[PDB]
Each structure stands twice: as C-alpha cells, then as structure tokens.
Design a protein around this nucleic acid. Structure first.
Lengths: 96, 249, 735, 716
RNA sequence: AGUAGAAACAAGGCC
RNA sequence: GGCCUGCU
C-alpha cells in the first residue's frame, strides 16, 4: 500500500549537517536505532525528541509525498541507522 | 435481355405472378407506396440514437461486391442482413468514407452541367462586390417575389412536358410542344445532357427546379430582383443594409 | 444582490423581449401511456356542453345521438353548442351578399377538381385508421388494403382510377349484407351490415405529444379511408372559398398572416377619426372543436351548393352526414399494476363497456359511468361536435362570416368591428364613438358568436387599445416583433441524412435571418454550434484532431491521402467554409473547385450503392414538424452524393403476427422496380391506364427489342430469343 | 348483330375489341355496329401484317407458317390493338429511332422497306372519298394511306401498293365474305350508317340505401328528410332572424369589460408544503474539479485514463463513511459502490492500455442502486382479476412543495464570472464582407463575456454527460458502464486543463419508447457540507471521502471533501434535449443582439463597442434589499444565458404552462404600463390558470416569485 | 428506491 | 445456458 525509499545518509564530522529524505509511493516520521539500543522516535509530521530539539527539523510535502529531515549540529551520539516510517523503510546509516 | 429475364423469373413464382397479373397500371403508385414503415415524428432524436449503433445506414446489395466486409483493422463496413421491407443491406457509416478514399472513381465533369442552379449561384457570388454597411432603420414590407433566378417563364405543368421530352422522349404521349421557347429549351438541354448518366429522376427534378417559376411571400426592403432575393439574408437586416452587386451584373 | 431576469421588462417592453418568455430550450412535455382517459373526457365534455339538445337512436348504427341544433338559447356564459340553423343560414347569406359570386365560383372549381381528381391523391396523407386491421397505418397501405377488400367483395368500380368512383364504391359498400376481411395470427372473417357501418364511421384516438404551452395533455383523432375522399373534396371547396376572403388567415403562411393583420389594423384605426375610439381584442375560443356540430357544416355546404348539379351537392354532403354519425375508438386501453403480487396488466379499451369499475379511480370511474351509455361495439358515438379540427377550413369560414357580419351595414349602429380569424384564435378590432359603444359592440359580437356554437375564452382573452395585440404567437406592437424562440428547436440536426442535415441547417439559419430577424453575429454563432453538433452526431470530426471514434480512422486516412484538404466535406472530416454570405449554397458546390478529382469522382459517383431515389415528391423534400404548429415540408438544396443514404428502418415487425407485410413489401418493390426499368417515367409521372402490368411490360419488351436492333446492341439471335421469351411468359400468364 | 361476332371471329380479336371497347368507356349493349366495324378493321390489320416476314434483305419473305428459326421478323408491325398510352409509346419510339416525323393521330402499322407508317381503314362507303377524307384529317402526312371498301376496289396515293397482290385478293375475298354473310344476316338497314360520333355522359352521384337514411338523421331537430331540408335552404332568405334571437336571448350572456388598473392585479399565490428539492442530473453550484493541466482538447483524449490521472493528482483519501443518508434507500450500497468504483479504477490502472470504455460487474449493490428486476412482470388480465390490490397506476396531482432560498442563490452564482474559458468554438469561413467583420467582432465580444461564466460550464457538463450516456445506452444496452464526468477548459495563462467532477454508472438501457427511463447512479466530489441545507438534498446520499488543502492566507484550510451519491434517471428525449444545451447561448445572445440592433436603429451607427466597454447604459437585472440593481450589458448576457440554461435543466410541463399563462398576464401588464386602457373579461380565470402550474418544480416557483417581485416593482 | 406526472418506465416476446 | 427486436 505504501513503499518507502530513504536517501541522504552517510559520514559527517562533529558539528556538521546532513539531510535525509524519504519518498513515499497519515503521520510519517523518522526513527533511529543505535548499536545495542532500542529504536527511538527522532521526529514525526510536528513532534520531536528532546535530544534533537533546536538541531533537527522535519518538513513534509504532501504534493510529492516526501518527508525531509534536516539534521544540524551533529554529535557522536547521533550515530545510528535512521528509518523512515509511514510501514518502515530499509534504514540509512548516519555516522558522525 | 436481362430485364425480361427477371420478369420471367418473377412470373415463375406464383405470388409475384398474381401481383403482376391482377394489379393494373393505375394502382402502380399505391402498391409502390405500400409500406409498413411509419413516417418518423422525431427524426433528430432517432438520427442521434441510430448513429450510435453499428450498421445504422442502408445500401443496395451491390455494396457486398464492391467494398470489403472489413477494413484494415477489421472494423466491419457492411452486413449481409437485409433491411426490414427491402432487399437492401444495413451497412456502417465507414462504408461511406471508405467509398470516398478507395471506391471507384468516375468523371464528374458533367455534374456542373446538371446542377445548373447551384453552380450558377456559386459563380454569381464568387464575382460579387460588397460595399459599406449603412446603419439605419429598415422599413421591411412584405411582398410576393420570385426566388428562382433561372426560371424560363414556365409553370410546373407547362415545363413538365418539356422535361419529359428532354429526358423521357417516348412517354410524352399526345403532347407535342407548340411554343418555340420550349422547342429551343428542349434542343439545348437535349444536346447538353445527351449521355449524362447521373439518374433520369434527378435530371428531371433539377430541370423542373431550373425552368419552373416559383414564388414566395417575404419581407423585403429594396431589391425585389431575383438575383437580389437569394442573398436577401446578407444584404438586408433589422438595422443595417449591406450594399451588394452579384457577379451577373 | 439577487438576480432576476423578469425585472428586465421594467426597461425593455414586454414584446421587445418576449423571446425570454419561451422556454423552448428544454424537452417538451410528452404523454407516457394510454390516451383513453383523455378520449373519454373529451367525449363526455362534448356531450355535456349540448346536454339540453334532443336524444335519438340511429336506425342503422343503433347508437345514441344528441342533436342540440335549434335548442334552447344559452342563459349563461358557459360553453354551449346550441347553434341555430336560421342564424347560421342568415350569416352565410350575408357573407354571400357581401361577396357576390363566391359560392358559385368556388363550387365550379371544386366540381372541376372532383370530376378530374384521381384515387392516388389519397396516398399523399399521413397516418390513417385502417379498419381492415383496426389500427393506424400509412395512408397508402390503408388505401391498398381497402381496395383489395372491396375488389374481393365485388366492388371494382375503383378500377376506373377515379376518386369519385372510389367514393361510389364506398357508398355502395354501405348497403351490403356481408363483407369479408382478412386477419393474421390467414383467417377470413365476415362483417355484417351494422359492424361494417360502425367500422367505417369510427375514428382512432391518440395522445398528442411534443405540445408546448399547456400543463395538461390532449387527445387527437384520425379518421378512416372511406371518409377521407369526401373530406378532401369538402376541404378543397372550403380552401377555394377562403382564398377569396381577406379576413381568413388559415390557408396562408405566417408572413401573409402578419401582412393581413397589419393591413386590417391600419384600415380600422386609420379610417377611424378622432371621435371614434378603437380597441383590439386578442381572443381565443374555448373548446372550439367540441362545440362545432357537423349538422351545421352540412347546412352551410348545402347553402353554398345551391343551384348546382345534384350529384355535386350529394358528394359534398356525404362527408358531414358521416361526421354527424361519427364514432370514436376509446383508445389503447388501461394498464393496471398490483404491487402486492408485483405484476402489471394491460386491458384493451373495448372492455370498458363490461369491465367492472373496481379497478378505476374515482375520476376514471365517473368518466366511464358517464360514457358507457354511448358505447356501441367498443366505440363511443360522438355526434354532437367535431373531435380535432378535421374541418379547419369550414370553421374558418364560419368565423369569417361572423367577422363580416359587423361591417357596419348589418350592425345598424355607430359601433362596428372587423379583424382576422384563424380557427381557435382571432384578433378583433372594434371601433365605436365611446366606451359604451365599444362595450355594446363586443357584447353583441359575443352574443352572435354564441348563436353559432362558437365560444370566446374569457380567461385567455383580453382587450386593450389598438396598436398592441397578439395572434398565433405573433406579437404586434406598432409593427410585428421577431421572436426567434419558436424556431429554436429547428436549429439542430434535422435527422434526414448527412448532406440533407447540413443543407437544412444552413437553410434554416438563412430563413430565420430573413424572416425572424436573426442577427449576423447570432447567425454565425448558430452556424458554429450547428457544425459542432453535426460533427459530434455523425462522428465526422475535422480529421486533424485526435478524437478517437468509430469513424476516426477512415476519415484520418482520407485526410492524409487528400492533397487539397480544404475541399473535403464536413461529413468526411474537412474544414467548414460556411459563413453569412455562403448560407444559400450547397456544401458540395461551395467546395467543388477545391476538391481533388479523385475524391470528387469517388464522392459524386452515380453507381454508389447508398443513394436511393423513389419519387419526384421525395427527392429533396424533408418533413419537419415545427414546434407549435402542424407538420410542414421544406425544399432543401442538396447535391446527390454518397452521403445521401437513407437510414435504417424500424425492423420490429419481425416479432409481430403482421410479419407477412414485409414479404408483400419486398415483392411489390421488386415488381415496381421491374416496371420502372420497363417504364422509366414511372417515378416522375405516375403511369395511368386500365391494363395490367405484364401486358405493358411484355409488349414494350417486344417493341424495344425490335427498335434497339434497328439500331443498337441487340442481334437477330437475341431479338428472336426475346420474342419467344415474351411468348413464353404469355403462355405462362395463360396458366 | 352481336351473334355474328360470337360466330365468325376468333377469340383473340373479340377480346382485343372488347378491351378497346372498355378503353373509351362506352357500353356495348347500346351500339354494337361500331364493335363489328372496328373488329373487322383490326382483323384486316392482322391479316395484312401477319404471314409477312423479312430477312436481312428487303423483298419480304412470305411464308404461310413461320418455321423454327431466328428468321421470324415481321414485315409490318402493328400499332393498334394496344392502349392509347402504348400506341403513343410505339409512335414516339419509332420516330426517335427511325428519325421519321411524328403523326398527330393513330397509325396502324410500320414497315421497314419504306420506313414509314400505314393507316389501314376499310369503310362501308367507297374508297375514293374516305381516302381523301382521312387525308385532310391528317396534316401534311408522309405516312402512306391505303384503304379498301366492300365493292372490292383498292386505291392509294403514289399508285403505291406495298406488298404482294395475292394478299390483297385475300383481303377482298375476306371483305366479300363479310358482305354476303351479312347478306344471310341482313344488317345494311344500318350497317352503312350506324355511327355518327356521339360523345356525351352525365355524372351520377346518387345517395340511396342506408347512406340515405343516415342523411335523414343528420338534420336539424324539426326536419324529416334531406329533400325537405334542402328545399327549405333553397327557399330560405334573410329576414332578420339574428336580431330576433339576440333580442330574445337572455341579457346575462354578455362580455362586460372589467377595467385593469394598478390596484387590480394581485400577487400570484405560491403553493405551501415541504421545501423544494434538487432535481438536476449533476451538481451545479457545489461541484469540485480535479485537474491535470494537459494540452488535449475537449473531445481529444481517452476518458478513463484522464479521469485516473486527475484523481491521482489529489492526496488525502480517507476510508469513506456515511455523513448524510439518502433517508429512503440503503446507504451502505452507495458506500460499497464507491469503493467498487475505486477498486476497478485501480484495476484498469494496472493493466496494459486503459480501455476506451469499461464495463462494471453487476453486483447486488448496483442492482439495487440501478433498479434492476424491479419492473412488475407483464401478464394477462384473465389470469389476474381476483387480486384485490390490482388497480390503476397512481395518477394524481404531484406533491405540493414550497419554494426554498437555495435555487435563488444557485441562479445567482450561475451568472457569475469564472477563472476559465468554457467554450472553444469551431471554425468559420474567413470573413469577406464588412458586415461579416461586424458580426465577427460582435461574436468575439459576446464570447469574451460569456465564456467565463458558470452557465457555459454547466452547458458543457450537461452536453458531455448526456452525449456519453446516450452513446453508452445505445451501445452497451445490457451491461453497466462507467463514465467519468470530464470537462476541459483553458486557464487565464492559456494552458489547457481537464476537470473531473466524478463518475456516472449507467445501467440497463433497453429504451424502446421516447419516454422509457434509463437509470444511472451519479457520484460527484464537493466541499459543500450537506448539514446546512439538508432539504435541498432529499434524494442524495452524501459520504465523507477525503480532505482538501487549498492555499489561503488563513494558514491552510484543510477542508473536508465529501461525495454526493444519488440514483437518477433520464430518457431518450431528455438525453437528446440535454445534449442540445448549446442553443441557450443562441437564445441569450440573440436577445442581446436584438437589443443592440434596436438601439442602433436609433443612432445611425453600430453601438456594440461602447455598450461593451463604456458600460454607461444598464438594465434592471435584479433587486437588492436597498432596491432594484442595474448591470452592464455583459451581466444581462450572463443572466439571460443562465435563465436559458436553467430552463433546459429544470424543463417540465409546469414550466411551459406557467410560461404561457404568465406571458399573457405580462402582456396585459405591459399594456397597462403603456397607457392603452387594458381590459379583461375574466381575470380570476387567468389567475387560476397560472396558479395551477405551480406544484413542486423549484424553477417554476422561482419564476413565479420573480413575477410577483416584478409586479410589485411595476404598477407604480 | 429512482425518473416522472392525470400514466407510464424501472426490457419485450418467442421457445 | 443457446438465438431474435428495439417508432410496428
């Protein structure tokens, strides 16, 4: 019914910025799972985790069904696999 | 040869033989109009309704041996199922357009000579010269005027004998036309249409239209001439006059 | 702000924008089921408007008939059919005096026509009630069936080919003990004297559809074939009479009607001095046909035909004699529904005489109870008055007599009146020195009308000062004003064929521009819309478009094949070159010089299997029933092309017991085609004579083989073969 | 004398002569000598023609009996023995093939050698007078004439005798056989002179038998026979009989004129009852459009693919649920039908090429929604008579309903401008005359005025929907068919665009009569909540299907988006008339052009440009609580176009009746306003005639309210 | 149910 | 289930 394709992951330095996107073909959002930790909510569309407030901004275009996540002021603690949800994407690695 | 042969074939079967024997010549018309088909009360509604069907028109049986049953993609052009009360077969409208793109061709040079009235209208209009439009109230008064601009000063019956002698010289009967105007008209329209093969009936109808005078009552303002009345819709209006001079003058 | 178009009349006079008050852009009302209720209501209403007459029982038909003539004078303004014989005879006498020589002349031309008329003239008519099958059939079919039955019964005077002889046979049939008819389900059935009398005196009732301008539906009638010849002769006399009367407007067209109305109003007002006041009454007659007694028409015609040969008087009197005893078939019947058992049923009207009244509602129950006494053999006697305008012209004659009876020579008073009468409608201009004079004049006119069985509809009539009035949807306001809303329904595809529809549409636009003052820009818009609808109806689009249809492929290949694509007809997917200047030119001739010779030859090919021409009458004549008027025929200019095909027929006869009619049709058409090939003039001039088919055909075969050898293709071998084949068919006809 | 023709002559000739006898219509019993004389003439014609053959030479071959061969040519070919029509047929054919001259009378034979006619006549009198007699009867004749006479003599001009003399000996032997056989009979007391050329007849049309008795029962009450009545009529003369009965007639029979003043006319009463409902076949004021911005033209394209592409342009679909029920049907059926339509639309989207026309499955849902198998089965009366419930069809006056304010607002917004051009006109011949240029400029002005009008959009919607419905009914008579409501417009920027209002499911359409009804179910998207004017949607079922976000300065609205679903029906006549809605444009613009021409007849100049640009002149085209409001000519154009469109949409017998009976009163009121002393004979009757047309149709009730308002504003 | 409105449709008949 | 008709 929906298929979810993520993009924009990779390798970034401390204090840097990275932009994830999710193409979907109700609520949609981004979750992350770090090694040995449970899967946590990052942002959904808005609502935001306290760890990422003032640093990460989610937006949604309903025309193109696309949910961007702008991540600024990145830290080592933000190293995780990031998953889109609407149904789950495959997950995109983010390494700070 | 053929004609008497289908005559004999008809007389072979008892019913047609009886019809031919007991029916007198005078009743010809009656039995020819004898039909179960009622005259349509609302032609537009059914023409808009029938054209949505397949095989909505009718054509002679000969179409089955000039036009293929189907076109390139397989759209059927004609059907072999005959009409209700005739030997004609129901066919699709494509069989018309097909006939206009790959059907047999002929020499249509003589149609201008037959349809004299319409081509004369076209020639008269093609060489016409328009003028300025003047806006002023027009006092349209109703008058009896002749619409046909080619009438040869003959009535319906008066020219009917001429038409028969021109087209059907043998069925004239007693009448031999006395007026010499009719003599010259017969000579001209005989030598002109000597081998035209459109149809005797249409030739007679168009000769009747051309030669016979016809008159109708219309609201006119000025003009009053035969050539100026056919364009009465273009030269005279409610509050405007359009000066016009047909090509003839 | 709320939009309200009617307020537009506060600035534009009513007549200058009357077109807005004609909702002729929607579907007109239609009847759905039986017309029996309307027929019964009309019969009862006609019989109760003449209740005070005298009752009798016909010794021949055994039906009850009501004669109100010379009955008590009306004492109320309700409709009354109590016409007085002496008054109407005096009115006709004054009509003759004011127009000396009218009756004698008209009778002379009518006598000429009657004694030279032929039987085939009866075929030129629409549906007629065939009594051989008790149903409506085309005029030609009914005439043929009646002639066949007469010949089978021994009445063969019609073989003389004269309509007068056919009527002689018809009357002689009235005195026969037992006739025989044919029925298919073939069975030969015997009809006694009375049954045949009632079958010949009966009318078939139907419901009129496509009637705009009233909330309720009406019923109309169609007579048989025995009485149509007398009606034809009587109407010929009445037309010849009315053509000599300027106050009549029935035998003329619309523009002539307007011209005569303008002339009469100008004559009445202009001759009136400053002292005389003038008033116009826009009068409609309530229950016009129901209050006209056929006996009074008999009186009028016998006064008209005074001092004439007795045979002429008899033949012209036969018609009203039969109308006075006319019967009406109740109709199709009544359909019942049972929702508890979920079923429906259709009972024929002939059961109304005996069927119980438990199934009928209160209104229909009372109508049946009131009409039952008049039921004789499934049909109701309708002696008191005419059913539906069969004698239009005689009614117009009576109205014109009333109009002329106030020429100021018979009024004997300062007031006087004139006007124009067309059956069921009239305009009356009355002048008098004072309002009292006008009132007296109108009162006396109304009173005189009530003495002739004619009633004035007070609800649909009004009187104002002269200069503004109405007449048959023609609104006069110091000069007639165009409407254009009456002709709106005629702006679509007529439905004849492609070329015919194109020519008819352009010609209608042209005519409405000439007569109904259609504007130039409006005419161009009408042309554009008509072309759009024409292309969308016949699936013939411009060809350069990608509109996929059932005909878009062949059209597109023809388009790509043609070099000069401007010459293609709109029927074949070509551009439209029509304009205000080209509305009087056929499409073929307008595009003749632009067509490619190959396409031109393929289009206008005589050997095309689509074009079919039957008779000179049906070459380029199209019957378009105009809105708010009787069926009319139009001459349309068109060139015989491959697009002149004729459409498919009904084809539903195959499921009916009347299936053998199609075989007879086919055989008759085969014989007619053979005769035409033998006699080429068969179509243009209908052949005459008393010989039989095969005689003429074989003898002409003899002669034509002879002469076509004396110069032509034939050879001695073939000529002798034809001669001996003629002998063979001769001996075959022997046996 | 007839015994002679019984005895001697062969059958062939006697029946030929009998048919010639019938030809001119005289009877054989009165004078028979003519029969014998002309039958002998015919016999000599045969005996002279037969037994005479020719071959490729001249020099006729004479054989007593024609042998079997192709050589059976006849020397002389007979003229007489035929009807007049055929005799003249042979005459004309011979003249046209032989190039000879046409005689004015009937010849008897034709010959090849001399290529000409023979008129044989054997008279009782001697030849040398009868010859020149018939010669001076025939004008300037080259046809050779030859006659015999009983004495045995022969003669001819040119001294010419055209064949063998033994044949002529035959002729005269036959002749004297005739003569000295009458000798045994004895007929010459009249044989020489028995015919003198009598031609006279009187036409007899006698009334007798039953038809006479009928004539005796079709007279005035106090007459006994047609003879007596005709005698009375012939003896009747005018002696002032109309005056006597006029004086005797009661004076209550009058046509008194009631003056019509400003205070006379009363407002038309409107019926009272439940509010009026919606009758249109599609949403007019509450329609919503899903678009693609494609470059295709109106007819260009394929419906299903365009509809699917337009619907995919919208996001926010929700599971549908009931919002406002039909109140008389089964709303779950409508819900299931909507979901079925969506599912099958996806099914088409999946496969290879979108079909031009799709058929849907006949589930119970649409079986109920389309009214299938609900017509009562037709049976015979003799089998259903004891059923108590069996009665007539319900035939009574329709239910009474009072006017509501929704139709007024619908008409108000039907005359408003739009952001699109809803008319793409066809091509016309290039204008050549100045009048054609004026017409084209006028037409361009009106098109600019009316194209951006909701009335034109309604016209296109109705035309397309009815055309598709009629074509589907005529093609797919049996099987339910899906048709997306499509209308193509052009934006202000000029980009073409498509619009999808919804879908129509056509059902079984075996339409025989013009009144037979085809039922369909219509679904249309909208944003208008049906909870505010429920009485206008009595026959609709409205679901909630999604949410729409249209850009607005108030954040973004995120309005609900509902689906109006209903079961409707039409007929062949209704479809045909709804597919000719474009003539509303005509009606309206003809009215406006008549206005323009009438005003321009005053000032000798075309007045269109200043009317459409300056907008100085205005007409009363509506009333506001402040008073009557006037608008420019363009607003009048749009108002008249909307009036015509609504006439075509809400057409009914009520509309026709009210229009006629209110045009009458409008003419009376106009006469009053013109100071023409109008008068009426029965105004109450006219009022009752008008008021009986107002029953339940919203359009006619709105027209009546408009008429009442016009009366109130008029008469001042 | 629906269309429609003084009576009808919501297929007909034939096997 | 198979076939016929759509103004008769």
């Amino acid at each position: 019914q929906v298929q979810l394709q993520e993009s924009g992951g990779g390798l970034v330095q401390p204090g840097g910025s990275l932009r994830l996107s999710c193409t979907a073909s109700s609520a949609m959002g981004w979750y992350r799972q770090a090694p040995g930790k449970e899967r946590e909510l990052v942002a959904r569309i808005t609502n935001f985790a306290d760890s990422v407030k003032d640093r990460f901004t989610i937006s949604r275009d309903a025309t193109e069904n696309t949910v961007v996540l702008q991540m600024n002021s990145l830290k080592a603690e933000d190293t995780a696999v990031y998953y889109c949800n609407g149904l789950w994407g495959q997950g995109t690695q983010v390494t700070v | 040869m053929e004609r008497i042969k289908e005559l004999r074939d008809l007389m072979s079967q008892s019913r047609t033989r009886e019809i031919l024997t007991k029916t007198t010549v005078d009743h010809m018309a009656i039995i020819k109009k004898y039909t179960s088909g009622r005259q349509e009360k609302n032609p537009a509604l059914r023409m808009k309704w029938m054209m949505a069907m397949k095989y909505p028109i009718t054509a002679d049986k000969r179409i089955m041996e000039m036009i293929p049953e189907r076109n390139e993609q397989g759209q059927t052009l004609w059907s072999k199922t005959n009409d209700a009360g005739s030997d004609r077969v129901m066919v699709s409208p494509l069989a018309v357009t097909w006939w206009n793109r790959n059907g047999p061709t002929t020499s249509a040079v003589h149609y201008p000579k037959i349809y004299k009235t319409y081509f004369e209208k076209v020639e008269r209009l093609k060489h016409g010269t328009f003028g300025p439009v003047h806006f002023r109230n027009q006092v349209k008064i109703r008058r009896r005027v002749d619409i046909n601009p080619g009438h040869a000063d003959l009535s319906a019956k008066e020219a009917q004998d001429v038409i028969m002698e021109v087209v059907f010289p043998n069925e004239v009967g007693a009448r031999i036309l006395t007026s010499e105007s009719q003599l010259t008209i017969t000579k001209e329209k005989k030598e002109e249409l000597q081998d035209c093969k459109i149809s005797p009936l249409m030739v007679a109808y168009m000769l009747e239209r051309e030669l016979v005078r016809k008159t109708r009552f219309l609201p006119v303002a000025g003009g009053t001439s035969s050539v100026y009345i056919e364009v009465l819709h273009l030269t005279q209006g409610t509050c405007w006059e359009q000066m016009y001079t047909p090509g003839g003058e | 702000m709320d939009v309200n178009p009617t307020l537009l009349f506060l600035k534009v006079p009513a007549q200058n924008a009357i077109s807005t008050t004609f909702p002729y852009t929607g579907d007109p009302p239609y009847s759905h089921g039986t017309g029996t209720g309307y027929t019964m209501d009309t019969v009862n209403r006609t019989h109760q408007y003449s209740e005070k007459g005298r009752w009798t029982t016909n010794t021949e038909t055994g039906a009850p008939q009501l004669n109100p003539i010379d009955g008590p004078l009306p004492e109320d303004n309700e409709p009354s059919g109590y016409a007085q014989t002496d008054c109407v005879l005096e009115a006709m006498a004054f009509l003759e005096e004011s127009h000396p020589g009218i009756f004698e002349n008209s009778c002379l031309e009518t006598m000429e026509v009657v004694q030279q008329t032929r039987v085939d003239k009866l075929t030129q008519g629409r549906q007629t009630y065939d009594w051989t099958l008790n149903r409506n059939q085309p005029a030609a079919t009914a005439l043929a069936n009646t002639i066949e039955v007469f010949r089978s019964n021994g009445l063969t005077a019609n073989e003389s080919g004269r309509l007068i002889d056919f009527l002689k046979d018809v009357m002689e049939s009235m005195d026969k003990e037992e006739m025989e008819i044919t029925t298919h389900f073939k069975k030969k059935q015997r009809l006694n004297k009375r049954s045949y009398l009632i079958r010949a005196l009966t009318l078939n009732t139907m419901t009129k559809d496509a009637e705009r301008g009233k909330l309720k539906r009406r019923a109309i009638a169609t007579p048989g074939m025995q009485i149509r010849g007398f009606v034809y002769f009587v109407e010929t006399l009445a037309r010849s009479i009315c053509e000599k009367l300027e106050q009549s407007g029935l035998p003329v067209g619309g523009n002539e009607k307007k011209a005569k109305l303008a002339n009469v109003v100008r004559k009445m007002m202009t001759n009136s001095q400053d002292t005389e006041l003038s008033f116009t009454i826009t009068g409609d007659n309530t229950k016009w046909n129901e209050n006209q007694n056929p006996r009074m028409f008999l009186a009028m015609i016998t006064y008209i035909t005074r001092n004439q040969p007795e045979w002429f008087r008899n033949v012209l009197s036969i018609a009203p004699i039969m109308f006075s005893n006319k019967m009406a078939r109740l109709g199709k019947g009544y359909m019942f529904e049972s929702k508890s058992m979920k079923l429906r049923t259709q009972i024929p009207a002939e059961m109304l005489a005996s069927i119980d009244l438990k199934y009928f509602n209160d209104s229909t129950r009372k109508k049946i109870e009131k009409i039952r006494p008049l039921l004789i053999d499934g049909t109701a006697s309708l002696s008191p008055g005419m059913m539906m305008g069969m004698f239009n012209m005689l009614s117009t004659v009576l109205g014109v007599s009333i109009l002329n009876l106030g020429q100021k020579r018979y009024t004997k008073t300062t007031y006087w009146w004139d006007g124009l009468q067309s059956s069921d409608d009239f305009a009356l201009i009355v002048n008098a020195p004072n309002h009292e004079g006008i009132q007296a004049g109108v009162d006396r006119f109304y009173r005189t009308c009530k003495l002739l069985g004619i009633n004035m509809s007070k609800k649909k009539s009004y009187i104002n000062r002269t200069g503004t009035f109405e007449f048959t949807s023609f609104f006069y306001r110091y000069g007639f004003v165009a409407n254009f809303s009456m002709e709106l329904p005629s702006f679509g595809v007529s439905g004849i064929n492609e070329s015919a529809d194109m020519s008819i549409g352009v010609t209608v636009i042209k005519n409405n521009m000439i007569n109904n003052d259609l504007g130039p820009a409006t005419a161009q818009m009408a042309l554009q819309l008509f072309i759009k609808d024409y292309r969308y109806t016949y699936r013939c689009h411009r060809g350069d478009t990608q509109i996929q249809t059932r005909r878009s492929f062949e059209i597109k290949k023809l388009w790509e094949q043609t070099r000069s694509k401007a010459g293609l007809l709109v029927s074949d997917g070509g551009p439209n070159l029509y304009n205000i200047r080209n509305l009087h030119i056929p499409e073929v001739c307008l595009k003749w010089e632009l067509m490619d010779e190959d396409y031109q030859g393929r289009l206008c090919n005589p050997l095309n299997p689509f074009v079919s021409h039957k008779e000179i009458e049906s070459v380029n004549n199209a019957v378009m029933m105009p809105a708010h008027g009787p069926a009319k025929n139009m001459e349309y200019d068109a060139v015989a092309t491959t697009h002149s095909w004729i459409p498919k027929r009904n084809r539903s006869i195959l499921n009916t017991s009347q299936r053998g009619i199609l075989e007879d049709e086919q055989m008759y058409q085969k014989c007619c085609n053979l005769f035409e090939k033998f006699f080429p003039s068969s179509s243009y001039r209908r052949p005459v004579g008393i010989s039989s088919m095969v005689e003429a055909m074989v003898s002409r075969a003899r002669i034509d083989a002879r002469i076509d050898f004396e110069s032509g293709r034939i050879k001695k071998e073939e000529f002798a073969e034809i001669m001996k084949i003629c002998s063979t068919i001769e001996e075959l006809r022997r046996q | 004398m007839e015994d002679f023709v019984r005895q001697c002559f062969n059958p062939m000739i006697v029946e030929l002569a009998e048919k010639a006898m019938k030809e001119y219509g005289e009877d054989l019993k009165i004078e028979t000598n003519k029969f014998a004389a002309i039958c002998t003439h015919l016999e000599v014609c045969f005996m002279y023609s037969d037994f005479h053959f020719i071959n490729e030479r001249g020099e006729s071959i004479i054989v007593e009996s024609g042998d079997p061969n192709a050589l059976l040519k006849h020397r002389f070919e007979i003229i007489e023995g035929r009807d007049r029509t055929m005799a003249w047929t042979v005459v004309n054919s011979i003249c046209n093939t032989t190039g000879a001259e046409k005689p004015k009378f009937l010849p008897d034979l034709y010959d090849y050698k001399e290529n000409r006619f023979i008129e044989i006549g054997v008279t009782r009198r001697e030849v040398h007078i009868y010859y020149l007699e018939k010669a001076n009867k025939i004008k300037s004749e080259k046809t050779h004439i030859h006659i015999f006479s009983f004495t045995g003599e022969e003669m001819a001009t040119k001294a010419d005798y055209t064949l063998d003399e033994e044949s002529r000996a035959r002729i005269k032997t036959r002749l004297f056989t005739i003569r000295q056989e009458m000798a045994s009979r004895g007929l010459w007391d009249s044989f020489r002179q028995s015919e003198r050329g009598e031609e006279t007849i009187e036409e007899r049309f006698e009334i007798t038998g039953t038809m006479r008795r009928l004539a005796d029962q079709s007279l005035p009450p106090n007459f006994s026979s047609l003879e007596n009545f005709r005698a009375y009529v012939d003896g009747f003369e005018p002696n002032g009989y109309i005056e006597g009965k006029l004086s005797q007639m009661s004076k209550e029979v009058n046509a008194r004129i009631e003056p019509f003043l400003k205070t006379t006319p009363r407002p038309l009463r409107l019926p009272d009852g439940p509010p009026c409902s919606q009758r249109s076949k599609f949403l007019l004021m509450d329609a919503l459009k899903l678009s693609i911005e494609d470059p295709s033209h109106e007819g260009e394209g394929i419906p299903l693919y365009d509809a699917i592409k337009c619907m995919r342009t919208f996001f926010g679909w929700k599971e549908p649920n009931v919002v406002k029920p039909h109140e008389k049907g089964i709303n779950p059926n409508y819900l299931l039908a909507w979901k079925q339509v969506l599912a099958e639309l996806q099914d088409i989207e999946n496969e290879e090429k979108i079909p031009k026309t799709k058929n849907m499955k006949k589930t119970s849902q649409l079986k109920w929604a389309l009214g299938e198998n609900m017509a009562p089965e037709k049976v015979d009366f003799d089998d259903c008579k004891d059923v108590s419930d069996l009665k007539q069809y319900d035939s009574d006056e329709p239910e009474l309903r009072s006017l509501a304010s929704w139709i007024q607002s619908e008409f108000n917004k039907a005359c408003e401008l739009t952001d699109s051009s809803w008319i793409e006109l066809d091509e016309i011949g290039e204008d050549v005359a100045p009048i054609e240029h004026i017409a084209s400029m006028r037409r361009n002005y009106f098109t600019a005025e009316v194209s951006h009008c909701r009335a034109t959009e309604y016209i296109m919607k109705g035309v397309y929907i009815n055309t598709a419905l009629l074509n589907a009914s005529c093609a797919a008579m049996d099987d339910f068919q899906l048709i997306p409501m499509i209308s193509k417009c052009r934006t202000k920027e000029g980009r073409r665009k498509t619009n999808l209002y919804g879908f129509i499911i056509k059902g079984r359409s075996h339409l025989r009569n013009d009144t037979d009804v085809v039922n369909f179910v219509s679904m249309e998207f909208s944003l208008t909540d049906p909870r505010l004017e429920p009485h206008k949607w009595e026959k609709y079922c409205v679901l909630e299907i999604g949410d729409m976000l249209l850009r607005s300065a108030i954040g973004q609205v995120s309005r609900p988006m509902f689906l109006y679903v209903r079961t409707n029906g039409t007929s062949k006549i209704k479809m045909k008339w709804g597919m000719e809605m474009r003539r509303c444009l005509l009606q309206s613009l003809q009215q406006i052009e008549s206005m323009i021409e009438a005003e321009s007849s005053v000032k000798e100049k075309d007045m269109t440009k200043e009317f459409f640009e300056n907008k100085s002149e205005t007409w009363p085209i509506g009333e506001s609580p402040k008073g009557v409001e006037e608008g420019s000519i363009g607003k009048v154009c749009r108002t008249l176009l909307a009036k015509s469109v609504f006439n075509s949409l809400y057409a009914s017998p009520q509309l026709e009746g009210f229009s006629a009976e209110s045009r009458k009163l409008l003419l009376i009121v106009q006469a009053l306003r013109d100071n023409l002393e109008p008068g009426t004979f029965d105004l109450g009757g006219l009022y009752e005639a008008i008021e009986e047309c107002l029953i339940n149709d919203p359009w006619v009730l709105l027209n009546a309210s408009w008429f009442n308002s016009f009366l109130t504003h008029a008469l001042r």
